[PDB]
Design a protein around this nucleic acid. Sequence first.
RNA 1: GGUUAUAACUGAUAUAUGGGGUUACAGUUAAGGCUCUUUGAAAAAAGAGCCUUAAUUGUAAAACGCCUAUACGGUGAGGGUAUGUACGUUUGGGUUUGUCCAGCCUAAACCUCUACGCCAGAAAUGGCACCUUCAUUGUGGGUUAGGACAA
DNA 2: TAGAGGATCCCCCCATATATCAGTTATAACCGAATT
DNA 3: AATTCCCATATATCGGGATCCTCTA
Length: 684
Amino acid sequence: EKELVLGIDYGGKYTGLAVVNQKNNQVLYARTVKMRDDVTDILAGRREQRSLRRTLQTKKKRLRELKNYLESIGGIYEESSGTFTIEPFRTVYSLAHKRGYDYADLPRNSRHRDEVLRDVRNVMTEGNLSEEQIIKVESIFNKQYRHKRFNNRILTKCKVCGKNTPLRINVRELLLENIVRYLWPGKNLIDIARNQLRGRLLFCKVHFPENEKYVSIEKKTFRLAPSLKTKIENVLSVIKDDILPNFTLNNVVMESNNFDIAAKTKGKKRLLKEEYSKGHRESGETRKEALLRETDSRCIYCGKGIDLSNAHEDHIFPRKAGGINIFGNLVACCSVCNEEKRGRTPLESGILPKPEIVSFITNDLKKKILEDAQYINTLDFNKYMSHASIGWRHMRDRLRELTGNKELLIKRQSGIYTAYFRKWWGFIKERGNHGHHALDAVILASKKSYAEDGKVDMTIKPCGEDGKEFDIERHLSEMKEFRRDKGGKSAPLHDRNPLSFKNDIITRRFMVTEIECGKEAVIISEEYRKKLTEAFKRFGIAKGKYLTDEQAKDAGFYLRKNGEGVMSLKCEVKGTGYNQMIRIKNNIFKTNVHNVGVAVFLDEKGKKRACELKNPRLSKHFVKPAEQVKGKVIFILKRGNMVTVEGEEMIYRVKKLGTSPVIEAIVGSDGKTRTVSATKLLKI
RNA sequence: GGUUAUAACUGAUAUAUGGGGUUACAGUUAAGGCUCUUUGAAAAAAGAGCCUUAAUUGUAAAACGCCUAUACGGUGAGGGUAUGUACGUUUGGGUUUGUCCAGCCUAAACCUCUACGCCAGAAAUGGCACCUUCAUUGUGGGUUAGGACAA
DNA sequence: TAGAGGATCCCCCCATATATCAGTTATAACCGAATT
DNA sequence: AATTCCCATATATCGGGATCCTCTA
Ligand SMILES: [Zn+2]
Ligand SMILES: [Zn+2]
């Protein structure tokens, strides 16, 4: 064990860690891990909820300020009605809720701020009011309560010292002198002058000019995405428990992910070198400008005129299920086509692109996605290619900190090299079971010596327990699972969609197109439910599909806005109990953190009894009363607690609380869960 | 090979909004039911009341809590505004708990680093905004749907 | 008539600006250490 | 003092409950 080498295979969702010794190429430890993949969705979803909450708070402040001013100038406000009785004041208050957008100048639910202001001004003028009041009202509409601060944010530290890195927009003079030091390299200097310069220097103002010949340190990485950061931490967690206390580390290698994102994103393998400089976007333009040029500044879906003030970059492939922000996934949507699509497949949406602009597109990738949105699934580009490539740094530094040896050697191995040895030593790369990642890790750590006559040497084969080569299904341990725990204080208290609880039944309103096929029995209406079933049978729609906009209109499901929009139906919500219902203010939500543990106590008679402990943060918000603890509690059960049955010696892990906890064996059981009452269960 | 620079390419974190949708309440309309009164031999019809299901209008709520009233806004009158001020520096605080952190927000004291936006002239910079003082009049403000460890 | 086993049920969407970093591809500049 | 830069198409692809119907002592 003189030389120990650890091989790490970094992947988008699975990472394989293996450590072997180069003395005889013997496998000492090999295990693949599974990283959390819901962090990106959770972080994105949290931001939307936070933005919506802050947006509503600003609306309340704007409405309160407008109401106070309206009352001052002669308005009468009634608390019961909540709005002014006078028509000029009532209209202004009503228009304040939807003030429109003002991020672009003027060249429909959301039309513009100017149109709303013009509508506001017209109703104020008709009310015989002074221009001073109109100006003040307009100022309230355009008033900003929370100022935007995007300048001076996320300051970069210098490579040598800790001083703040100056912004590149005040460095344009310095960057010009960096090229004139030496000596087609003629258009390079033009770029710094006449375009945006986003990105810090990674250096301060005293080392960048003259001390640029400081090539002694690695590229420091200070900022990492939380989803990518927790993926590395989960991998490092496995290393600390097993690799750290068992064996020492002398060398570490990693699989370099040269996915060629600039090449696989266009539906090709590797385009020309000269075509890498010029991307899909037009020269001297943005994504919106480039999208309009390919559509001739019109709309693909409806053909109406599109300007920069209303152009939307739609995702032909919805982001609700999949969705990738590529140039070939966004074409055009002006005001209503985006609203009608609302994040669903165009084939399922039914708003087919007009066959007059598709033939005018010069991009071959756009042809396939528009004809069939499902083609992106068969594309050779995935979001995990960037996930695997991004994050190779900030891992060696953390590895060096954990295991010491700040002078650790870092090497990168390409996937082509490990493929040669895998197919030559007698290994098969199966796209099925995930145990094949530990083997990539072993080939990553294995000594590479061809010798012989140009063929891979057979005496350097990795060894199993004693000499039995390396078997994925025989010489591997259990692959670790990293999941999300909802028992913490950071988990959501309830669902984001309020529910209606009238006459002791949980119901909610759902769109006709949003109703899944085969689940129409929940509709309370005895006439629209039959109509929905008839439409499904007539059009020949299987289970799991929806109704398109054209099909819904032709089936009489469009009597919402003068025959120009789909309606909504009130249907009962399945898979919900009374204990999950919590009422906050006038809203009612369904919760999932209502159970925090199982408490077992002694009854008055003497027999043991089990109850469910409720969340302290939601105890007073429960619609129905719960059951408390009467006798003395002997023990309290919790999630992730190793328990055993009264008539068995196996170890089980509790997954669900309640009077009948659900338990599952740590090793084995083929993933099947076991349900048993807590009375006949004991905690180990 | 490393570092850095210029293009481009995806990946994912904050920020500030524009909508759709959901729920509560209060009106209106349509259709379908249940009762009462009444026209009526009867058939039947009308009026009134209630319910259900759709369409429509307005208003309101959207995590619990914790912290802050020594706080947080409106109006009017002064001053300060690259010599300045914080999105910056230094030491802290709130969220914040069994413990620690992220992300936001913020106090006192300071310009070494970092950043400093809009609307208007014919060189003279004016308004807005920001900061601050005072008076008057209100009850507001921040954070919270993420990650670890421990019980 | 009570509790497990076994079906199937349940979760919010679109977009517009404003900033930033972290990876890849290409070209160019050097720096540097190994290799020849 | 001139040259190499590890050998040498591949790598990446809910959880925590709930009801309903069916068995079992
Ligand atoms: Zn420096
Ligand atoms: Zn359109």
